[PDB]
A paper describes a structure:
NrdR is a bacterial transcriptional repressor consisting of a zinc (Zn)‐ribbon domain followed by an ATP‐cone domain. NrdR binds specifically to two “NrdR boxes” upstream of ribonucleotide reductase operons, of which Escherichia coli has three: nrdHIEF, nrdDG and nrdAB, in the last of which we identified a new box. Tetrameric forms of EcoNrdR involve alternating interactions between pairs of Zn‐ribbon domains and ATP‐cones. Our results, in combination with a previous structural and biochemical study, point to highly flexible EcoNrdR structures that, when loaded with the correct nucleotides, adapt to an optimal promoter‐binding conformation.
We present crystal structures of EcoNrdR–ATP–dATP and EcoNrdR–ADP–dATP, which are the first high‐resolution crystal structures of an NrdR. We show that E. coli NrdR (EcoNrdR) has similar binding strength to all three sites when loaded with ATP plus deoxyadenosine triphosphate (dATP) or equivalent diphosphate combinations. No other combination of adenine nucleotides promotes binding to DNA.
Residue numbers in the entry:
A (entry chain B): 1 to 149
B (entry chain C): 1 to 153
C (entry chain D): 1 to 151
D (entry chain A): 1 to 150
The structure:
């Protein structure tokens, strides 16, 4: 009984795309009874590791905390949201790849820096300025000299 | 590449029992290379996506913010509130149908433009004049002309 | 207690310029304790006539009902708020000028349209569409023709 | 010309009461020619001007919008919230000082840049990068070179 509108058991499937670099399956189902079509998300029953914050406190992985940081650094940058979601899926993929119960907050940060360098070099400097907490304006020139390698 | 352990593309499926009172599909998957087994949960996304506003800020979907815009354009028009609620439910339905975490504010606008075109063509012009921010009176005539060619056919 | 920052009772006055062609008095006041400068507008509270609505019901004059209708028509338009307030003050001035107990809602609407024609011609069409309740899309072309030829 | 009925310049004042907590001055004026007595209300102009956005659209002044921008630039900076509120009150003060019904969004941004230069020079660069929408990493070096002369 997959239909949520008329509550009919059989629901025919139309499409089956692979989103999130293979982490989940998006399907385009439609019920035979009513003329209503909807989307479904088949995801694997595994957990993203816990985050080991700067103050050694463990916290559940929140992809929105990760995303918001990136969007603040990308403020007026011409980087599409599909590229951002691709970078977020790749960082999650690499976090899963460790096979650890928990990952430090510093590891997530470095993986974002790794994506932002590819996405936008201005946005990368904006992120590093707060991520690495710049205490002098000279820290900006040092990150640029580091990036012109 | 559905495998989460070794990252192999092809993942064979073994079982498929409908669980959660038919609301979701619990399946058993097995990798072909690492030979591990895991559980899958296919659920319908029925939550309303976030709105990516004109200033790139994300905002929760507010059906009242959608309805007010329509009622301003539908001022003094003979379109009943049951037709308005039907149009609002159809726009929400189409927004759910995308299967997205967030939809742009522009997508919502285009969807109410097609509903208002069906509901009231005077109300549609009123909405389009602010939605598309008309800067000249000639823009009004252009929207009417690029409407009368459709009715002609 | 005229000071709004430190809440001191005595507030000394330095300047007094008559603004709005005598309709109000601008004055600079500077607190004695916090020493900060601010403006105070002395304006007259006058009687505005009652509004005889489309359904012949009388209603007190509403400067916000008047302003909101204009701002709905003036959506996304580049017309400054000083020009808007000038237009609203001129309509109120003309309403008072009749010297009548009550004015019809139709009189208010015509006066608003006279101001919107000067302010923004796109906004004028938006207002006229709801004000004159357009029943066909051809009503839009008629209002545009009614301005392009006879100014 | 304070008289609104006959339009006479000189208007004699008779009374001078106060709006509760001295927030306003009620007056009872009388014309010398038409001899009419009307009421006056002198109140402090504390409402903030409208913001003329980058796309010439007018918007009400939103303190949260102004403050949020500063707090994003002042992330992890040792600038206390009392200094931030002082800078926000000084920008609002300068906005009322113009005596205009509306101020451009660009003027607000320059006044924030003026405060952030005093508050934190790292935070000033962070604000300048988005405010002046940097399109190249070289824009950062240019803003720093501008600052190192003084
Ligand atoms: N719970 C979380 N889930 C996912 N990403 C997180 C989470 N907490 C932090 N992050 C991300 O980790 C990266 C680095 O974190 P950061 O360097 O800020 O350290 P922290 O110890 O989490 O402290 P804070 O967030 O207060 O700075 C950033 O991209 C941030 O958005
Ligand atoms: N949070 C929201 N939830 C639902 N509908 C919304 C929301 N925000 C805006 N809308 C609707 O989206 C459509 C188009 O929005 P619009 O073109 O106005 O752009 P915007 O970027 O949201 O800016 P604004 O609302 O200031 O015009 C309108 O029907 C509007 O009512
Ligand atoms: N009480 C009021 N005070 C001031 N202006 C008013 C008042 N009521 C209506 N107006 C204004 O009068 C103008 C014309 O009014 P309108 O043509 O809308 O007629 P109405 O009989 O008031 O009906 P409705 O407001 O329902 O349309 C508009 O600018 C409107 O904002
Ligand atoms: N309505 C508002 N009230 C108060 N401050 C505002 C308002 N809108 C913008 N600001 C502030 O004005 C300053 C400069 O604005 P900005 O340069 O961003 O231009 P804008 O035309 O408002 O466009 P944007 O949407 O990109 O901010 C910033 O400090 C911003 O926070
Ligand atoms: N204003 C900003 N400009 C550019 N990058 C920013 C800005 N604010 C945050 N970031 C980036 C770099 C930060 O290290 C990263 C994460 O932001 P941060 O405030 O540390 O919170 P967080 O996402 O770790 O969550 P929390 O504060 O709850 O621990 O986002
Ligand atoms: N006066 C009006 N006449 C006709 N249609 C209008 C009018 N005002 C708004 N609309 C229509 C077109 C607009 O693009 C749409 C949405 O209203 P708008 O004022 O833009 O705010 P919104 O609901 O999109 O977001 P927000 O609440 O964040 O401003 O409604
Ligand atoms: N969507 C709109 N677009 C443009 N102008 C509008 C819009 N809605 C209203 N107006 C303008 C033209 C209308 O004749 C005028 C008055 O608005 P209306 O909703 O009739 O209320 P009102 O101000 O007369 O109060 P009330 O309806 O309570 O009597 O405002
Ligand atoms: N991530 C950031 N790091 C540093 N400064 C920032 C950041 N984001 C914004 N700012 C500063 C500089 C911007 O010009 C200023 C205002 O932000 P902006 O996104 O332009 O919106 P705003 O406050 O003008 O409102 P809106 O865009 O909704 O009209 O705040
Ligand atoms: Zn069904
Ligand atoms: Zn495997
Ligand atoms: Zn923004
Ligand atoms: Zn109404
Ligand atoms: Zn004081
Ligand atoms: Zn609005
Ligand atoms: Zn008609
Ligand atoms: Zn007199
Ligand atoms: Zn924080």
């Amino acid at each position: 009984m997959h239909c949520p509108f008329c509550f009919a058991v059989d629901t025919k499937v139309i499409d089956s795309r692979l989103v999130g670099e293979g982490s989940s399956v998006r399907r385009r189902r439609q019920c035979l009874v009513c003329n209503e079509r909807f989307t479904t998300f088949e995801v694997a029953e595994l957990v993203m590791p816990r985050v080991v914050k700067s103050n050694d406190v463990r916290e559940p992985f929140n992809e929105e905390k990760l995303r918001s940081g990136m969007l603040r650094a990308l403020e007026k940058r011409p980087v599409s949201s599909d590229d951002v979601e691709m970078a977020i899926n790749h960082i999650k993929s690499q976090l899963r790849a460790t096979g650890e119960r928990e990952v430090p907050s510093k590891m997530i940060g470095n993986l974002v820096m790794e994506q932002l360098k590819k996405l936008d070099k201005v946005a990368y400097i904006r992120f590093a300025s707060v991520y690495r907490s710049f205490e002098d304006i000279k820290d900006f020139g040092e990150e640029i000299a580091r990036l012109e390698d």
